[PDB]
With several copies, the nearest count.
Chain A
Amino acid sequence: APKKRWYVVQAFSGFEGRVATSLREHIKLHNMEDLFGEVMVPTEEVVEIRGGQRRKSERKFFPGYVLVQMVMNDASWHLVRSVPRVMGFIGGTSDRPAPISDKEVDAIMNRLQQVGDKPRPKTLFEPGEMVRVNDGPFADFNGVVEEVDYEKSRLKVSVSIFGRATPVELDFSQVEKA
């Protein structure tokens, strides 16, 4: 009853995807699916409709690394080191890697449930920063966000109208810097 643990291997700067591909391909090559459970590359999908990048954006939990459900053995070890573009086994001493803890797996998977559940636009806003308005009704004016909302997403923002400052309910789509 060989329980395949979870290990992590260093990928390269901009190679992670094709690395995971080639990994599964070499698994199929040696038919060692029993030894290699799943190659996990967690990611994130931050969604903004305008502001350059539009309607989506793809982040990752952490670059340069790939997560595998391998089982520990020298054969599997070289099977992962006989791949195009990886570094050694991220962990303890080389040729004797350190499987990541189960708590790590559980926490990361809770992270994945959270991120995949709600498409959460990052580059968020903080109550107290000043910001302009690129929208028709208040073109190029500038006030301070007095409250940030996410579901309603309507930027309670104090701005100067008729002398007295007053809140305004303009949406994210028209905010300036910050």
Chain B
Amino acid sequence: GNRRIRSVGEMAENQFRVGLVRVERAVKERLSLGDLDTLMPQDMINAKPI
């Protein structure tokens, strides 16, 4: 009752979220620095780290 199993699904989404927080920081800073409204919501993210 104190030791839970953890399948491939939960672990996979966890690695997803972990790789996601870093691109979150990056896109936050790029939204901060760069022009607020001159862009399409299509490149401020970089999916390569994901």
Residues of A within 8 A of B (CB): 21-22, 25, 84
Contact = CB atoms under 8 A, between A and B. Distances in A.
Interface residues of B, number: 3
B13 interface: no
Interface of B: 29, 32-33
Contacts of B29: 22, 84
**Residue from A21, A22, A25, A84 with most neighbouring chain B CB atoms (10 Å):** A84
6 contacts: A21-B33, A22-B29, A22-B33, A25-B32, A25-B33, A84-B29
Contacts of A25: 32-33
Contacts of A22: 29, 33
Contacts of A84: 29
Contacts of B33: 21-22, 25
Contacts of A21: 33
Nearest to B30: A84
B21 to A, nearest CB: 15
Nearest to B34: A25
Q: Which A-B residue pairs are the 6 nearest by beta carbons?
A: A84-B29, A25-B33, A22-B33, A21-B33, A25-B32, A22-B29
